[PDB]
Ligand binder design. Structure first.
Ligand code: THP
Ligand code: CA
Length: 129
């Protein structure tokens, strides 16, 4: 996989964010994770964590997987990096997201994320508390 440039337009919630990619505004949905909706338990904390991450970053990057790059709602599907750290992974590692929506052929970082989930679960963090 390859990291590509993007810039932040606006934080949205734990697992979606608005970025400019190839010069065009798009909403990205983070691959392989599910954060709680803002209205649910840990939703506000997931949103806050994801917002801090992308707002503090000097460099945002988008990494597509091998399969579909847009979902049925026209959201981009990608792994999002903030100053080299994967947002998808960081949410999971903090117990603010579950590994989820693992579809065949867009699952390159599955085992990396499951390893983070296991560690979050072990330390009983947030969702796992
Ligand atoms: C993460 C992801 C979500 N989706 C679709 C599945 C779900 O369909 P449904 O809306 O029919 O439940 C929805 C979940 O996104 P959200 O968790 O943002 O609601 O997005 C994909 O198709 N591919 C993906 O990789
Ligand atoms: Ca969600």
């Amino acid at each position: 996989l390859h990291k590509e440039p993007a810039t932040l337009i606006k934080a949205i919630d734990g697992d979606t964010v608005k970025l400019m990619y190839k010069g065009q505004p798009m909403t990205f949905r983070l691959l392989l994770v599910d954060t709680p909706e803002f209205n649910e338990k840990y939703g506000p904390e997931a949103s806050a964590f994801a917002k801090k991450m992308v707002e503090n970053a000097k460099k945002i990057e988008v990494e597509f997987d091998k399969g579909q790059r847009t979902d049925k709602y026209g959201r981009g599907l990608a792994y999002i990096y903030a100053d080299g750290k994967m947002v998808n992974e960081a949410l999971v590692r903090q117990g603010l997201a579950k590994v989820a929506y693992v579809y065949k052929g867009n699952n390159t970082h599955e085992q990396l994320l499951r390893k983070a989930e296991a560690q979050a679960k072990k330390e009983k963090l947030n969702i796992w508390s």
